[PDB]
Amino acid sequence: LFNGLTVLPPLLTDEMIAQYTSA
Amino acid sequence: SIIAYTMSLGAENSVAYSNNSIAIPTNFTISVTTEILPVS
Ligand SMILES: *[C@@H]1O[C@H](CO)[C@@H](O)[C@H](O)[C@H]1NC(C)=O
Incomplete structure (x- = not known):
C-alpha cells in the first residue's frame, strides 16, 4: 500500500468480503 | 431508541451435501422483477 485531507474506511471489510466469497 | x-x-x-445426493424441484414459479435504467 495532515492538512485537511481525510481518508475514510469502507462499508465492507477486508474480512467480511473474504466471507462473502466463501459462500 | 437508536442502535x-x-x-x-x-x-x-x-x-446438505453427500456424494450420493441430489435436489430436484417439483413445482415451478413465475416472478416479475424490475430494472430501472436511464436513457437521457
Ligand atoms: C404449485 O404452486 C401453486 C401455488 O404456488 C399451488 O397452487 C400448486 O398446488 C402447486 N403444485 C404442486 C404440484 O405443488
Missing part, C-alpha cells in the same frame, strides 16, 4: 450493529451478510444456511 449500531455489525452488518449481517445474510441468514446462515447450508447445503
Whole structure:
C-alpha cells in the first residue's frame, strides 16, 4: 500500500468480503 | 431508541451435501422483477 485531507474506511471489510466469497 | 450493529451478510444456511445426493424441484414459479435504467 495532515492538512485537511481525510481518508475514510469502507462499508465492507477486508474480512467480511473474504466471507462473502466463501459462500 | 437508536442502535449500531455489525452488518449481517445474510441468514446462515447450508447445503446438505453427500456424494450420493441430489435436489430436484417439483413445482415451478413465475416472478416479475424490475430494472430501472436511464436513457437521457
Ligand atoms: C404449485 O404452486 C401453486 C401455488 O404456488 C399451488 O397452487 C400448486 O398446488 C402447486 N403444485 C404442486 C404440484 O405443488
